[PDB]
């Protein structure tokens, strides 16, 4: 019923970003936590990407994991600066290539069963954009959302990505909104749980990681987190899946929990964005406790913008709002008339 949503805009719906995220929260995309949009045929952000091989990236990391029975946790080893050409040949090395797949679900099943085996390299969260200046849709590194009353949390990162590279179990920063576009290369796998279900995924990980969760209010913003989906479905998790290939946007909304894993050498390029629904959940945002260097926004200015009749209530700490999940962004209204 909060199934992952799968949109293909026209140009002219398109071009505007911001109204399209309302036209397809009008449509309930929100409730999956997760939404995939197809963008129009013609329509490409850059030319060619055979000009980026000398692009760097400072801080490529490898992932070790440890676990067992569908629980792990990753950690992450920084390796030395290799420009993109070198990181491509090690992708595509046989030590690190894709193994041989027939159906989705087999590919899924040696992820897996392999994920602590012969750690792998991710090139992410590189400053940078591949959009060339002038494309003006859906454009990552300037998007001008409401978030912009804030290199930062309305910056473009770029993803490198290799076979068997994850991201684990998380809602994005100040649980915003975030975009993701698959340049190019091979497939992006995502799981995600809605948002009305997100604080029975915290419960579980509460009970499997009860240190972590002693030690930090808000561990799995660590980004370390990995369960698997079988144990998912064992203890009644609802969630879903989605494959995201080139060309593909993803969009994560405010409190969705979501993670995956990349097919094999890809570029991804994200960011956050906000719309005024999100403020609520910026508000609410149970933050990461045990690090000094975590992403924090000040909500002064967007509730004396947006919510002038409550500032004051909600600095005496009296806002008693309760988020429904459910609720499109108030943006939606005219698709709703
Ligand atoms: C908005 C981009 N961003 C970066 C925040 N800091 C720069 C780390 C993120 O953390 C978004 N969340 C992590 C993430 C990473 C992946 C991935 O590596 O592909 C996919 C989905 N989500
Ligand atoms: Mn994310
Ligand atoms: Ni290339
Ligand atoms: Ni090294
Ligand atoms: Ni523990
Ligand atoms: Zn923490």
């Known amino acids: 019923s909060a199934r992952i949503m799968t949109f293909y805009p026209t140009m002219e719906e398109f071009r505007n970003?911001?109204?399209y995220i309302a036209y397809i929260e009008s449509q309930g995309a929100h409730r999956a936590g997760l939404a995939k949009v197809v963008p129009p045929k013609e329509w490409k952000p850059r030319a060619s990407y055979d000009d980026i091989d000398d692009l760097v990236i400072p801080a490529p990391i490898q992932q070790?994991?440890?676990?067992?029975?569908?629980?792990?946790?990753?950690?992450?080893?920084?390796?030395?600066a290799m420009t993109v050409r070198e990181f491509r040949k090690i992708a595509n090395s046989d030590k690190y290539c894709t193994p041989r797949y027939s159906e989705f679900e087999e590919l899924e099943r040696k992820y897996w069963k392999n994920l602590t085996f012969n750690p792998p390299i991710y090139g992410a969260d590189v400053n940078g954009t591949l959009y060339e200046k002038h494309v003006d849709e859906w454009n990552?590194?300037?998007?001008?959302?409401?978030?912009?009353?804030?290199?930062?949390v309305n910056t473009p990162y770029l993803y490198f990505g290799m076979w068997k590279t994850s991201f684990a179990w998380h809602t994005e920063d100040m649980?915003?909104?975030?975009?993701?576009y698959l340049h190019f290369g091979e497939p992006k796998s995502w799981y995600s749980v809605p948002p009305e279900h997100g604080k029975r995924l915290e419960r579980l990980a509460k009970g499997f990681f009860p240190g972590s969760a002693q030690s930090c209010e808000a561990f799995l913003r660590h980004k370390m987190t990995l369960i698997s989906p079988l144990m998912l479905k064992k203890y009644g998790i609802p969630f879903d899946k989605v494959t995201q290939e080139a060309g593909e946007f993803?969009?994560?909304f405010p409190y969705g929990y979501?993670?995956?894993?990349?097919?094999?050498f890809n570029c991804a390029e994200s960011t956050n964005f906000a719309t005024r629904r999100w403020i609520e959940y910026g508000k609410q945002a149970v933050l990461c406790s045990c690090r000094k260097d975590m992403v924090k926004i000040s909500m002064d200015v967007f509730v004396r913008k947006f919510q002038p009749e409550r500032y004051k209530l909600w600095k005496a700490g009296k806002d008693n709002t309760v988020i429904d999940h459910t609720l499109p962004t108030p943006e939606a209204a005219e698709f709703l008339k």
Request: proline share 0%; charged share 15%; aromatic share 10%.
């Open 17 to 19: 970003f911001s109204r």
């Open 140 to 152: 990552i590194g300037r998007l001008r959302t409401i978030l912009d009353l804030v290199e930062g």
């Open 175 to 180: 649980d915003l909104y975030s975009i993701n």
């Open 258 to 264: 979501h993670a995956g894993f990349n097919h094999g």
């Open 250 to 252: 993803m969009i994560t």
């Open 64 to 80: 070790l994991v440890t676990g067992q029975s569908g629980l792990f946790t990753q950690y992450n080893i920084q390796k030395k």
